[PDB]
């Protein structure tokens, strides 16, 4: 044949892959965690969005920390040979490095380790995307007026917010991040590379959103998401 390049992930396997959405809305009383109003808007948006990208979407609601770990374990032990990629979406309370089951926390590193290059072989070399709508701390942004491959390779963490910061969720419209994510995937998934889509998501969140609160502490605050990429190639959701 003629000259061949290689800087984009192969996305023309028979299946695009799984999209696991963990939607945690109601939390055991003993945890002391509030209900996450509007998260169902988010779960439903994501479901539709990723359906249109031809992912096999599985929605899960209100999982204990035990259920989260066993679900991720089981999904990682499936044969993904015919799938191009893996996507997992976490919607819950959180803190830096941490996501909450309905009855207590889960180390994010525990969840993602299941999918390490050496531990999930049918996903080695393929993009593993973790999209996390959850707090990474309690800081507020007050804004300003304007072997042979690493086992950690081929991961992408699309964080809703900067390290150390709260993440904002609107109980009517859904979270700022997920709203913006789905809109940008809708409009640009058939033409832009994923990092450039996520960059549009950064700008949308940074520019179009600002908290309104009766509490001065939480009023007029801003948010910037955080793209953490360990990808080794460009990711286009379409192929030719």
């Amino acid at each position: 044949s003629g000259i061949s390049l290689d800087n984009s992930y192969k996305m023309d396997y028979p299946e695009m892959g799984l999209c696991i959405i963990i939607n945690n809305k109601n939390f055991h009383k003993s945890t002391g965690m509030t209900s996450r109003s509007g998260t169902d808007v988010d779960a439903a948006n994501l479901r539709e969005t990723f359906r249109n990208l031809k992912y096999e979407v599985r929605n899960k609601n209100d999982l204990t920390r035990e259920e989260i770990v066993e679900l991720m374990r089981d999904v990682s032990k499936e044969d993904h040979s015919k799938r191009s990629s893996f996507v997992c979406v976490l919607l819950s309370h959180g803190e830096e490095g941490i996501i909450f089951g309905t009855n207590g926390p889960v180390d994010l590193k525990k969840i993602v380790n299941f999918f390490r290059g050496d531990r999930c072989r049918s996903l080695t070399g393929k993009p593993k995307l973790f999209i996390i709508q959850a707090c990474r701390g309690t800081e507020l942004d007050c804004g300003i007026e304007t072997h042979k491959i690493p086992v950690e390779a081929d991961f992408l963490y699309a964080y809703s917010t900067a390290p150390g910061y709260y993440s904002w969720r609107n109980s009517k419209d859904g979270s700022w991040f997920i709203q913006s994510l789905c809109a940008m995937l809708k409009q640009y998934a058939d033409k832009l590379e994923f990092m450039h889509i996520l960059t549009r998501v950064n700008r949308k969140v940074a520019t179009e959103f600002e908290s309104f609160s009766f509490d001065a502490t939480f009023h007029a605050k801003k948010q910037i998401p955080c793209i953490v990429s360990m990808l080794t190639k460009e990711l286009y959701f379409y192929h030719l």
Binding site: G38, G94, A134, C135, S160, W168, R169, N170
Partner: peptide
């Protein structure tokens, strides 16, 4: 608006 609420925080997660």
């Amino acid at each position: 608006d609420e925080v997660d």
